[PDB]
Each structure stands twice: as structure tokens, then as C-alpha cells.
């Protein structure tokens, strides 16, 4: 692990990758691994990584990163502030409510249509965010390391091909 932090991308309105790449990349960005640079540069072998399309790709990654970060940070901070004793009222396995929330905030339910795996990540991530602010771990630099670790440790690798579900077998060929 190396502290790779670029305070950029948020205002990097670059284009060269198609809107298919935005959908595909973000879906692949969903809860892979804290070393996102590995996931990024390895899984986008085809992408050449010109500064323009790189700032674009990382803008997508920083859009989802910043929004999801601020989302869970908001929910946990609100939970501690109000004294909410149950995370299960906000961003846990919470059918209808959390579906409506992540839909209205991000996109029209096309984010896998959130299977139980994403409710499980939501469960564990918000549980650890809550745990962080309540125990006073949030003011410690390592809290985010810890979050990204626990949700990476579930699925470090994307097991889902978007082209066609039963097409990943076809990637294994000689």
C-alpha cells in the first residue's frame, strides 16, 4: 500500500472514451480493491491512458469515490449526531428505501440493479463508517484504509462479465 492521492479529476472535463466505458468502468469500480491503480491499469489493458482519457476515467472513479464517500460519511455522521441506534434504518440491506436512495442520487437502478452482494457491502461499509465516527476512528487517517479493506476483502476481483453472463467461459480459450 502506497498513499497515492491526486487532488484532481473533479473539474477534469476530458473526453475520448465512449459512454459505454463510463457504465462498464464504474460497474467494474464497484468494490474491487483499495489498490484501485492496480485494478484500473490492469483491467483496462485496451485503454492506452493518454492524460485526457485518464483524467476522464479517474473523473468517473473520483465521481463515484467522492459521492459514495460523502454519502456513507453523511449517513454515519447523521446516525451518530441523532443517536440512531440502528444502521438498519439507512444504508444496510434495506429493500425499497436504499434502492430509492442510491437510484435517485446516482442513476436509474442500472448499477447491477443492486443484488444482495451490494446490500452486503452497504451493510459492512456503513457498519464500519458508523463504528468509525462513534469510536472516534474517523479523525484517524487509517479509517478509510479500513473501510476500503473490509469491502475489498469480500470481492477483490470482479466475477461478473457485462457483455453476456455466460461469456466469461469464452475468455478461457487457446
Curated annotation (Swiss-Prot):
Cellular component GO terms held in the UniProt record: chromatin; cytoplasm; cytosol; nucleoplasm; nucleus
Start and end residues of each stretch annotated as Homeo-Prospero: 14-172
Region: Essential for nuclear localization, interaction with RORG, repression of RORG transcriptional activator activity, residue numbers: 160-166
Cellular localisation: Nucleus
UniProt keyword Signal, yes or no: no
Tissue: Most actively expressed in the developing lens. Detected also in embryonic brain, lung, liver and kidney. In adult, it is more abundant in heart and liver than in brain, skeletal muscle, kidney and pancreas.
GO molecular function: DNA binding; DNA binding domain binding; DNA-binding transcription activator activity, RNA polymerase II-specific; DNA-binding transcription factor activity, RNA polymerase II-specific; DNA-binding transcription repressor activity, RNA polymerase II-specific; LBD domain binding; nuclear receptor binding; RNA polymerase II cis-regulatory region sequence-specific DNA binding
Protein family according to the UniProt entry: Belongs to the Prospero homeodomain family.
Protein name per the record: Prospero homeobox protein 1
Organism encoding this protein: Homo sapiens
Source lineage: Eukaryota, Metazoa, Chordata, Craniata, Vertebrata
Amino acid at each position: 500500500m502506497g498513499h497515492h492521492h491526486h487532488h484532481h479529476s473533479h473539474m477534469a472535463m476530458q473526453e475520448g472514451l465512449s459512454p459505454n466505458h463510463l457504465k462498464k468502468a464504474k460497474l467494474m469500480f464497484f468494490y474491487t480493491r483499495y489498490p484501485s491503480s492496480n485494478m484500473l491499469k490492469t483491467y483496462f489493458s485496451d485503454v492506452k491512458f493518454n492524460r485526457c482519457i485518464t483524467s476522464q476515467l479517474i473523473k468517473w472513479f473520483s465521481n463515484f469515490r467522492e459521492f459514495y464517500y460523502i454519502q456513507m460519511e453523511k449517513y454515519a455522521r447523521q446516525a451518530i449526531n441523532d443517536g440512531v441506534t440502528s444502521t438498519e434504518e439507512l444504508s444496510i440491506t434495506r429493500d425499497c428505501e436504499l434502492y430509492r436512495a442510491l437510484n435517485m442520487h446516482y442513476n436509474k437502478a442500472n448499477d447491477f440493479e443492486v443484488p444482495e452482494r451490494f446490500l452486503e457491502v452497504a451493510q459492512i461499509t456503513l457498519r464500519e463508517f458508523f463504528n468509525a465516527i462513534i469510536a472516534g476512528k474517523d479523525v484517524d487517517p487509517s479509517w478509510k484504509k479500513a473501510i476500503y479493506k473490509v469491502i475489498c476483502k469480500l470481492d477483490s476481483e470482479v466475477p461478473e462479465i457485462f457483455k453476456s453472463p455466460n461469456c466469461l467461459q469464452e475468455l478461457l480459450h487457446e
